[PDB]
Ligand code: HEM
Ligand code: HEM
Ligand SMILES: Cc1cc(N)nc2cc(-c3ccc(OCc4cscn4)c(CN)c3)ccc12
Ligand SMILES: Cc1cc(N)nc2cc(-c3ccc(OCc4cscn4)c(CN)c3)ccc12
Ligand SMILES: C[C@H](O)[C@H](O)[C@H]1CNc2nc(N)[nH]c(=O)c2N1
Ligand SMILES: C[C@H](O)[C@H](O)[C@H]1CNc2nc(N)[nH]c(=O)c2N1
């Protein structure tokens with residue numbers, strides 16, 4: 001592979017040079033003859049063998065000691081030797097608290113699909129590796145939610161549960177986010193609530209959840225400790241900050257009865273550090289407005305509110321060349337940003353966030369030699385070309401530590 | 417082998433086998449994806465014959481006569497010609513087939529549902545820039561068609577030794593001039609500021625207006641290029657007005673109806689056609705989002721948001737997004753009111769999804785570049801945003817080539 005790769009910004013003419021791609025360690029899915037850049041995702045007995053784990057751990061420990069400007073030091077060579085002995089005798093090893101915190105921050109720094117990474121070094125890391133039971137997981141998660149929410153002044157955080165051992169004792173959060181709304185398929189085929197969560201909602205109901213059967217019912221936590229069957233827990237509702245959606249001009253917008261929760265906290269991804277696998281690592285930030293106003297609300301397979309909003313706006317909905325959909329989409333996103341700001345709950349619009357990401361990307365190129373970025377995900381779902389990322393060439397590649405996808409747990413769990 | 421693509425709204429899964437027939441590179445590797453790089457980086461009788469054989473084979477396969485008498489004869493026929501001339505000449509049927517399939521294979525084009533409806537103008541007997549100008553005037557008149565636009569391509573002589581290239585120096589046949597001002601700013605279209613100065617430097621008397629149709633700069637057989645004014649009655653233009661905002665017309669905006677890209681290279685069976693202007697009709701966002709609202713283009717967002725009396729103090733009011741939607745309503749309304757062919761990004765992307773289904777059924781796939789297919793506004797309220805796509809390189813194809821003024825040795 002070539003040592004220097006150039007990326008260009010076609011609005012500003014700025015050219016940046018990437019060398020960090022040479023450090024990439026996992027596959028994009030593309031080949032020389034096909035590009036899979038728009039593919040969304042390109043056995044539990046299997047865990048890292050001794051021989052696979054050795055080079056992965058050395059790679060991360062070297063990177064850690066190089067970051068603290070102690071590469072090649074006595075403390076470096078001694079940590080290497082102690083890690084190697086642990087893998088030799090126990091087939092695995094344990095990270096130090098310093099290495100855990102470094103690894104989590106760098107998995108975020110390395111997340112090529114995240115536009116919010118200018119914040120990567122301000123991540124509060126909660127070490128939950130002493131947790132043993134689902135009740136304990138519930139406690140850790142409640143504390144995470146309360147800390148991150150901070151009465152509306154949201155703070156990015158991650159809680160890290162024990163790593164995988166033999167694969168038959170995994171910790172898992174079965175929820176895809178800590179806070180989401182239930183979805184209910186009706187006998188007539190319609191859906192009440194969030195259609196994205198119908199499957200998970202049905203699992204909660206089978207596990208014993210009594211559903212309120214409303215439009216915005218916070219789902220329970222479904223928590224798996226040490227490979228046991230998962231257990232249900234209700235998040236204390238006073239820990240769930242929510243925002244009623246209203247519009248600064250349209251008085252009728254409030255009459256739609258829309259709200260959303262303040263804290264986006266993804267809980268189904270796997271954190272890989274030094275070849276170790278943390279299958280339960282819920283992490284949270286704050287929202288970009290379009291995540292709610294465009295995707296959650298206006299996706300056809302989600303809440304799908306464009307039609308009702310266009311109606312109340314007295315729009316011509318017969319010919320799509322009136323752009324009645326586009327006009328309602330803007331008003332919805334104006335309303336989402338106005339409601340969050342009015343209630344003093346942290347949110348960022350897509351102009352500010354993409355402008356910050358460009359400044360972040362330029363800084364990473366200068367100090368780190370690159371910034372992996374997935375254009376298909378970084379460019380916002382509305383108004384793409386009037387944000388600066390649209391015109392920014394990006395290189396995508398996979399560095400470690402990383403956040404990864406993992407199969408859904410109900411597809412893989414062995415029921416006791 | 418077999419690759420699947422899912423649409424995440426409709427759950428439709430398609431299976432791609434067509435990609436197995438690519439042999440050119442994308443630029444990505446197993447470890448680095450260059451899917452958002454705009455341009456990821458003469459033949460010989462040795463290089464030229466396998467490419468000719470591949471194309472002849474696929475043509476005769478396409479017309480259900482593989483291995484037949486006519487197939488074997490053409491193969492041997494092309495053999496002798498490459499041997500004794502270092503090149504060869506396409507049959508008319510082959511030129512037409514190759515041009516339609518270069519369009520069919522253009523992964524970045526959302527308009528390909530129309531691919532087999534293309535008027536092919538054979539200009540391979542052209543020898544001079546006056547000849548080129550004649551052929552181009554006829555192209556414009558035919559394709560414009562009093563507003564009922566018709567897709568067309570005009571194909572000039574192929575490259576020979578690289579020293580005798582036919583080139584259209586304009587990037588499009590019809591574009592507006594760009595003038596760098598004394599006070600540092602720009603009048604007209606900033607995208608063409610450089611080309612506009614090369615035309616002034618070559619003798620063009622600029623009207624120094626906002627919407628000055630550029631002259632044609634035409635290079636035949638490697639000679640210096642020559643200026644030509646397209647006769648104005650051939651140049652169809654649309655004054656932009658808004659259906660609700662009666663003040664929009666006072667902005668003094670207009671655009672031309674005919675998008676005719678003239679700076680790309682057409683490759684067919686190892687032959688290179690360096691002058692091949694091709695045209696269709698506009699998708700509204702090409703004018704209303706990119707041409708008008710790019711910072712490096714006409715950049716009218718703030719002017720429009722002014723007359724809408726929007727609070728422009730904070731970005732979170734989405735004042736830019738509101739003004740952008742209204743501009744694009746005006747463009748669609750203006751073309752439709754003047755009965756000039758135009759397609760909105762909702763209709764265009766849904767046609768593309770239907771095109772994709774067709775190509776997967778009858779062809780085993782459809783190469784598609786998500787980064788270019790998704791429109792530059794309202795992305796996820798169009799169906800292509802939620803459609804997985806596979807991008808790969810099929811030939812015949814349209815390729816990029818250097819700007820002529822970076823390579824042409826004058827005299
Ligand atoms: C602090 C403010 C943050 C903002 C504004 C933000 C913004 C975003 C957005 C808009 C996306 C696209 C998600 C989608 O469209 O569904 C995303 C993806 C992602 N973010 Fe961030 N994020 C933030 C914090 C974080 C943190 C704290 C982490 C991890 C420690 C993180 C890791 C990720 C990852 C891994 C993805 C990719 C998810 C996937 O591939 O499915 N982000 N982020
Ligand atoms: C007939 C109606 C057509 C429509 C609505 C249409 C639409 C588009 C659009 C919106 C783009 C993206 C351009 C941009 O964003 O700057 C594009 C690209 C492209 N179109 Fe089409 N197109 C049409 C016809 C054609 C024809 C007739 C040809 C050739 C015979 C063609 C070949 C291409 C190519 C090669 C590209 C990619 C250009 C590049 O890579 O820079 N298109 N088209
Ligand atoms: C920390 C943070 C802040 C913030 N503002 N947004 C975030 C969004 C994600 C995110 C969003 C969509 C996702 O999956 C979509 C999907 C998968 S398959 C069909 N659709 C996932 C993966 N589970 C994560 C993750 C973290 C975020
Ligand atoms: C036939 C047709 C119809 C239609 N409606 N639109 C079209 C748009 C293009 C098109 C759009 C962008 C392009 O390059 C952007 C660039 C390169 S370097 C800095 N920017 C080119 C290549 N010159 C062509 C080509 C054909 C079209
Ligand atoms: C098909 C396509 O890959 C898919 O819709 C992607 C496109 N880009 C995205 N970008 C973001 N930020 N989030 C998404 O869920 C998606 N979905
Ligand atoms: C950096 C990025 O590749 C570049 O801005 C591309 C993105 N997508 C595009 N898509 C279209 N249709 N046209 C374009 O010019 C571009 N520009």
Ligand SMILES: [Zn+2]
Pocket residue numbers: 030034035036037444448449450451
């Ligand atoms: Zn790729």
